[PDB]
Design a binder for this molecule. Structure first.
Ligand SMILES: CCC(=O)CN([C@H]1C=CN([C@@H](C)C(=O)N2CCOCC2)C1=O)S(=O)(=O)c1ccc2cc(Cl)ccc2c1
Ligand SMILES: [Ca+2]
Lengths: 52, 234
């Protein structure tokens, strides 16, 4: 249930608040419109292996 | 690193190396942001003057991404104790900002509750460094990485001749000859989740390297997240 079921469908952090899943992201990312995916705000975001 | 493999191009970009007056590495570190490096407090008693090098995979050849940075402020945890290595954590603020590029990027800091419930319950984490390849051997010229299983807490306490505090966790193998070693101290322990890497530990100590019935002991980063946040604003 909730965060215990596939990370609550969140890309990164999952929290259980009241009866529902609430997703969030690390510093340097913003939460997408769908409230689940995390979008890098700029070049070389934290935690990503470098390709260029 | 005993056992393991080489980090391939761009795979370990958060690796930092603490270098002495002779340009020799003595400890590792993790890049947290353009101004801050995470390391072990015990590494601070290993050199009078030192600098930090990033973007390096081979200490014997110029690759194109190497950069040396001077240290402006050293912030060591005031409760660190050499007796047990409890609170083995420090943050370094650099004089000049790190310019991110191929092989140079920060690892993510996770939130405590989620990291303890979701990251630290995965099967494995990843340790890296330029440390000794054998307990009594020499340091590696190549940057190495190694997948290390999370180890049951009760099993680790039973195997240890030294106290395991609330500020430590265990990772590695019982008999398989793979582990971190001298010179890797202060380096990164990261956990992967959906292709994003989060810092979960700091290479701290061990009774020798890769010995039978003994594990690698890491500083429990999740217990220090508020502390790290305070140190990075000052
Ligand atoms: C000269 C420094 C040295 O030899 C350190 N190494 C180990 C030898 C003893 N210790 C521990 C037991 C120790 O001295 N402590 C006393 C204070 O309380 C904590 C324990 C070592 O750490 S080492 O170079 O073989 C070494 C260092 C770091 C390691 C990190 C991991 Cl994850 C695994 C093995 C390590 C071995
Ligand atoms: Ca090089």
């Amino acid at each position: 249930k909730l965060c215990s079921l596939d990370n609550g469908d969140c890309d990164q952090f999952c929290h259980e608040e009241q009866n529902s899943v609430v997703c969030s992201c690390a510093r340097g990312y913003t939460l997408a419109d769908n409230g689940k995916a995390c979008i890098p705000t700029g070049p070389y975001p934290c935690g990503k292996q470098t390709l260029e | 690193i005993v056992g393991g493999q080489e980090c391939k191009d761009g795979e370990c970009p958060w690796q930092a190396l603490l270098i002495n007056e002779e340009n020799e590495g003595f400890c590792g570190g993790t890049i947290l942001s353009e101004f801050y490096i995470l390391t072990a407090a015990h590494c601070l008693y290993q050199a009078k003057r030192f600098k930090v090098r990033v973007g390096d995979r081979n200490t014997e050849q110029e690759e194109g991404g190497e950069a040396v940075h001077e240290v402006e402020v050293v912030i060591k945890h005031n409760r660190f104790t050499k007796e047990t290595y409890d609170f083995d954590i420090a943050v370094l603020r650099l004089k000049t900002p790190i310019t991110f590029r191929m092989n140079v990027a920060p690892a993510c800091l996770p939130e405590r509750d989620w990291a303890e419930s979701t990251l630290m319950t995965q099967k494995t984490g990843i340790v890296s460094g330029f440390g000794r390849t054998h307990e009594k051997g020499r340091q590696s010229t190549r940057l190495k990485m190694l997948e290390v299983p999370y180890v049951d807490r009760n099993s680790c306490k039973l195997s240890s001749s030294f106290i395991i505090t609330q500020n430590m966790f265990c990772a590695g193998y019982d008999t398989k000859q793979e582990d971190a070693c001298q010179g890797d101290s202060g380096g990164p322990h990261v956990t992967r989740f959906k292709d994003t890497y989060f810092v979960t530990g700091i290479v701290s100590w061990g009774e020798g390297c890769a010995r039978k019935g003994k594990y690698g002991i890491y500083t429990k980063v999740t217990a220090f997240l508020k502390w790290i946040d305070r140190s990075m604003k000052t």
